[PDB]
Design a protein around this ligand. Sequence first.
Ligand SMILES: [Mg+2]
Ligand SMILES: [Mg+2]
Ligand SMILES: [Mg+2]
Ligand SMILES: [Mg+2]
Ligand SMILES: [Mg+2]
Ligand SMILES: [Mg+2]
Ligand SMILES: [Mg+2]
Ligand SMILES: [Mg+2]
Ligand SMILES: [Mg+2]
Ligand SMILES: [Mg+2]
Ligand SMILES: [Mg+2]
Ligand SMILES: [Mg+2]
Ligand SMILES: [Mg+2]
Ligand SMILES: [Mg+2]
Ligand SMILES: [Mg+2]
Ligand SMILES: [Mg+2]
Ligand SMILES: [Mg+2]
Ligand SMILES: [Mg+2]
Ligand SMILES: [Mg+2]
Ligand SMILES: [Mg+2]
Ligand SMILES: [Mg+2]
Ligand SMILES: [Mg+2]
Ligand SMILES: [Mg+2]
Ligand SMILES: [Mg+2]
Ligand SMILES: [Mg+2]
Ligand SMILES: [Mg+2]
Ligand SMILES: [Mg+2]
Ligand SMILES: [Mg+2]
Ligand SMILES: [Mg+2]
Ligand SMILES: [Mg+2]
Ligand SMILES: [Zn+2]
Lengths: 159, 104, 213, 75
Amino acid sequence: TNTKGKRRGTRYMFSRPFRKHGVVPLATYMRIYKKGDIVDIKGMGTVQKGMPHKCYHGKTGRVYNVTQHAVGIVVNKQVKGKILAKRINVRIEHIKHSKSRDSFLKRVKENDQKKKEAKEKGTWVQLKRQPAPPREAHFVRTNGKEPELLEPIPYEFMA
Amino acid sequence: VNVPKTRRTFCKKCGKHQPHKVTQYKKGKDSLYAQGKRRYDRKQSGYGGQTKPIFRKKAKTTKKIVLRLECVEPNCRSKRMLAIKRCKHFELGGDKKRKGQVIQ
Amino acid sequence: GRRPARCYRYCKNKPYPKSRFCRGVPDAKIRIFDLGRKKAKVDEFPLGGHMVSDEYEQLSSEALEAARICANKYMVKSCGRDGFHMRVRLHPFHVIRINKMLSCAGADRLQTGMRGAFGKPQGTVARVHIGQVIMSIRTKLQNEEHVIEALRRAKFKFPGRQKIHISKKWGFTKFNADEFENMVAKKCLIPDGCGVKYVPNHGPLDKWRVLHS
Amino acid sequence: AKSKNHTTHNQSRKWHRNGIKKPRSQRYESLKGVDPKFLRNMRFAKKHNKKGLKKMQANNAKAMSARAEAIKALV
RNA sequence: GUCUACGGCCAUACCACCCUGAACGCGCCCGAUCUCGUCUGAUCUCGGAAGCUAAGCAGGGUCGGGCCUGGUUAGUACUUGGAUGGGAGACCGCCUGGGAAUACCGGGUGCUGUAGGCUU
RNA sequence: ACAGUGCCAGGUGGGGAGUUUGACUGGGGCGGUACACCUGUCAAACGGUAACGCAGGUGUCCUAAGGCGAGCUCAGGGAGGACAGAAACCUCCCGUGGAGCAGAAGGGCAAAAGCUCGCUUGAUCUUGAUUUUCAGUACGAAUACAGACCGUGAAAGCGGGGCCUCACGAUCCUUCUGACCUUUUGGGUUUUAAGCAGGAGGUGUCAGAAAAGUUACCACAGGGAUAACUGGCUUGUGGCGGCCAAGCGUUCAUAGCGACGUCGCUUUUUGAUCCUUCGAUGUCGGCUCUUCCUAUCAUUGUGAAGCAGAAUUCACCAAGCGUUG
RNA sequence: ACAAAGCAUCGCGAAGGCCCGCGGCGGGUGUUGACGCGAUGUGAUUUCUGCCCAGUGCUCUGAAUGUCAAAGUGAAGAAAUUCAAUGAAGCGCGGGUAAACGGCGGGAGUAACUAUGACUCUCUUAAGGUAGCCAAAUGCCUCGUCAUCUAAUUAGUGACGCG
RNA sequence: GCGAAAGACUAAUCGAACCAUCUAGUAGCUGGUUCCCUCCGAAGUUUCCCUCAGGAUAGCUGGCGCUCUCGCACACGCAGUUUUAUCCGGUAAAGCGAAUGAUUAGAGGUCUUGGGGCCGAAACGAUCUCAACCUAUUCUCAAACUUUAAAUGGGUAAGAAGCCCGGCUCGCUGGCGUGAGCCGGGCGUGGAAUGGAGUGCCUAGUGGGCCACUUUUGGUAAGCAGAACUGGCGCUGCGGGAUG
RNA sequence: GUUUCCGUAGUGUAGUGGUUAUCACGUUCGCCUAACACGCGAAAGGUCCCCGGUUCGAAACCGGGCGGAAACACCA
Ligand SMILES: [Mg+2]
Ligand SMILES: [Mg+2]
Ligand SMILES: [Mg+2]
Ligand SMILES: [Mg+2]
Ligand SMILES: [Mg+2]
Ligand SMILES: [Mg+2]
Ligand SMILES: [Mg+2]
Ligand SMILES: [Mg+2]
Ligand SMILES: [Mg+2]
Ligand SMILES: [Mg+2]
Ligand SMILES: [Mg+2]
Ligand SMILES: [Mg+2]
Ligand SMILES: [Mg+2]
Ligand SMILES: [Mg+2]
Ligand SMILES: [Mg+2]
Ligand SMILES: [Mg+2]
Ligand SMILES: [Mg+2]
Ligand SMILES: [Mg+2]
Ligand SMILES: [Mg+2]
Ligand SMILES: [Mg+2]
Ligand SMILES: [Mg+2]
Ligand SMILES: [Mg+2]
Ligand SMILES: [Mg+2]
Ligand SMILES: [Mg+2]
Ligand SMILES: [Mg+2]
Ligand SMILES: [Mg+2]
Ligand SMILES: [Mg+2]
Ligand SMILES: [Mg+2]
Ligand SMILES: [Mg+2]
Ligand SMILES: [Mg+2]
Ligand SMILES: [Zn+2]
């Protein structure tokens, strides 16, 4: 049997990456979070107060609370089946803004724009994304060379 | 461990930090007339043998030490409990431990 | 003494290197990984003969022992005591274990069977991959056949199979042998006893000023 | 009388037979867990929305008649 | 072109040495009356403005070490799936897809934010 | 006036009574504790995962070894400097951490979390919310807040024990503390007792029985879920046999041998294992009797010899018939 | 194997020893009296019966300043009560007892072949196994060593004894 | 009870008689458990237990429903998918001329220094030598090492509960504003493919498992012991593998 | 193989809690003696088994090893 300890096996997880042991860069606690914002937890060794727990390391969740230097945040945690939407309290040093959201809200700001315009025209524009289509028959042109002849090369034991 | 004989901390009644007089706690003499004893008396009474369990399996070698604080200002004198983590050695007012000296 | 090499032939368990975590290891049997004239120069021994493994297996410390000696003996011979250099390129590094021989006296009364099956260190063993070299010899280009036969005899002290191969390098370096003389004059390479130092167009200019001076 | 000591063998089957359910989320989730000084204030904000409903109602008809004028000026 | 004050990202900014710095500043620098601190006005605190770029700092320089990025190593090592494939076995080949790391070669060497100067 | 009987009290009491005499466990017993916890690993790059799998640690210690605040810089090395040497003390230079941070390791740490000082009690009082084991129950431990009282610092802040991951304990009972608390019963006053709210006294089998043996005089319910025979799988060990060949053999590797190594066979050794049998397969030898194998001791036929003869080893076809008192 | 004669301890002068019974001023030994009764141990005869009272027992006109209850007495209180002084037997302390249970050791040097060691050093304990006896029904190593008995003996007998 | 003692004997019975009753004593343990057809259909895992042949609770199962959806030319929702973005990761591999830990060789070094020497009274004098260090090198390694660093894989996100305006409320927050909360208007298919979804009650059986690909821990190995991932067998016949 | 116990002067043995090392004998030197004994005075002698760690400091406290010893290996 193994030990239930809160920081078991994190020997390699919470470890500051490389050539970064030291002062936390001050930007990381001067960006703002407000309820609704989506956040990806990523623990960190230097700050021990308010750490998450290793099963949330790498997970995302939205924000529901904001205290003086921590953020209440709801993530999903799968347990033997049933997924429990549970809310944890994590100090800011272990948190980033997830740009996972931000591809859309840029497809949105552009979709809303491309619909307000081209509405004075009435021309229906492709608003939906659409997966990578078949590559659309074209030409190839060799100019004045035949292709280069390739031959499988004779084996020889290198060692 | 070692603790000082006095300390300033919250006195529940005054609503303020106030000087206290620290002393460690010893149990009281058991009543002989508390309900539990009176009951245990006249069930462990008669031709029955022993009735309630009794310990013969002791495990730990120390008890949590309990400080019995009391308000120094008069008219309050409201004693209060304070438990501390265990220790098999304990004193009061013992010798502030003298950094940077010769260990003879 | 020791179980036959059968039982410790395959690489089953993760490497068990001698460290603070296993101790009391009996010192490896093979000790001297190179003999002959290890005081040679690169400029006088152009024949990199190899003995390359063809199977992913283990080699006992005591095997690398006999394989070296029996090659020292078909060498200094036809070659002479000065005319070669022999390298063993597998240091027995991984510690092999033995459950304690299930020792019993008389018929028996008890052994516990498997409780605490974990056993003691018994010896050491080399890990070998396909296409990885075991032994390498270097002599004069004159003496090719005697490298082939000296390595051919050492095959018979080894389990599994291994091909004998003559390298395109110069002696023990990493440099293709058709190119050595060219990279020696103009000093892309500088003699360094056995090996050779590849000097690039990188460093301070005064480091050059020594050469071509 | 030794026995097996553990396994997660067909457990994936079991808890995926009723198809692991991401927790059904409604709008308006509970405020339980938010710091009291937020609520202890936002309840006073909510409790006195009505004091100031006259401003809200007349100022609503102002924009409702200014945008009934904006949609009629377009007409 | 550049500095000073406060900075962001934290080596393309470091380190080693080499060369050059107009004017503003930054500094070295000159004192211990008061404030303050020491075994020592060495540091810190304070009052200064006689000197000098000697150094820090700035700016460059090195077939410089380091870092930052590309190439190669290499479709190599490894691997998701697949077969009534091979092999006594170790292992190995192919099909369907993904795809690294050194040594070895190149290129680069701090970008900027706000507020104030100087080159009027 | 005690002997003695009547009744209470202390002692003594396997003479007698009742009962108990843990669990895990490559059968059990004896050995351990994998029985509550904590590191690194195993663990297959989310988490989670087993064995009496490894390598280890805990039942602590701290009045500061905590809380702020300053102030510096550590291990190690070089060069110097009266006694002074590999080591005392002083001084300069280098010093990304190679020291230190009470302990196991693992993470984390530099005008710090390290060391040195001054001031201290946030190790205090009080509701809830959440994390960790998880049933998503407790206990423990922890994380964010909010409300008081403070400590500290110019201040921003920081601080409700110990830089982070372990250092702990229900019901019942007992004790202590708190409220001009409630009940103490037909009213009223005092004791006394019972409540309410927090601490302590403890269960180490650590979600918590008050507990020694023996049975070869033994009993019952069962168990092939669990041994002692056979049989299987395996083959370490045992036996038998090859390959390479350094050497022995006066000389000569291989007539006969053969080290250092290496590949196998075999189930006439012992082990491992626990698949079969516990509504029982009679569990050592010897006697008798049959048959079979060849890994040939003799005899038929042969090839080898360091075979002159004799004698003798080595090998081949060979199990026909022998192998005793 | 038991018994046994014999040897030996042990209690007891009768309101006694041992013992039965549910109870009586009840019964057994007892129609008894220490040459008797009860309780054990060994086992004829012969020859002997060695050390140890530290342990556990038993026991002793033995000190009970150790403790120790019921009552009893003393004190405070309004009373339940609370607190005092005191103190029986046994426990603690001190004698005796092994024909009570039982116990009875380990190291070095040293003699003129070698070896062995009379002899001499420490250490320990409650004494450290004496007279005898032994590979015995008691010896692991073990088919101990020598002899004898056999053609041949893990058997037998006899000696040897750090057992 | 009785025993010249074996636990002997006490009416075929003795380590404790026979008879009736208390008595249908208790059993986590063996054995059995009675008609058909139809539909659905498991577990051998979780935590706690004087728990390990048993229970408790989790799951997995069935029954009963309900709430709606609309194939009634006029659908939202979900998913053991995949794309498109986007974070997370320390295994295979690699490396050790990058740290830590091992380790071979030479060249280079009186680095330091030594311990022996040989030539020296002695001498960093000469020549060696071996030790330890280190300057460029080189051979080989690490499960409890790591600069690097995959494959498979884990999170989210891909809109109406969404955007965009207007305005009120505050005991929080502040030079003003923040922020949150409200009211009021203004605007629709936001990647592929699939399928009606949501939710509440009771609840049996089970809690000995076994095998195979790949991964992998003890062991020499096992039809051995122990994990992962999926698949099976148990619960299941049929064609094939002679037989299974 | 598992569980214990030790190692200290030439020898057998004390000893502490982490600041020190004993006793006895042996031995060396004197003195008595005609000469040995005996006796009296003085003397010298150990990394406290080898190790690594903790610590200001280890002979003594931990961990490993080496050597000498003791105790278990039962039911078939
Ligand atoms: Mg009574
Ligand atoms: Mg000055
Ligand atoms: Mg300058
Ligand atoms: Mg200058
Ligand atoms: Mg460069
Ligand atoms: Mg009894
Ligand atoms: Mg058991
Ligand atoms: Mg995984
Ligand atoms: Mg500070
Ligand atoms: Mg507060
Ligand atoms: Mg601290
Ligand atoms: Mg009354
Ligand atoms: Mg018997
Ligand atoms: Mg008997
Ligand atoms: Mg079985
Ligand atoms: Mg068998
Ligand atoms: Mg010869
Ligand atoms: Mg099994
Ligand atoms: Mg039968
Ligand atoms: Mg034959
Ligand atoms: Mg007797
Ligand atoms: Mg006697
Ligand atoms: Mg006595
Ligand atoms: Mg005798
Ligand atoms: Mg006799
Ligand atoms: Mg006979
Ligand atoms: Mg005899
Ligand atoms: Mg059953
Ligand atoms: Mg890992
Ligand atoms: Mg069952
Ligand atoms: Zn008070």
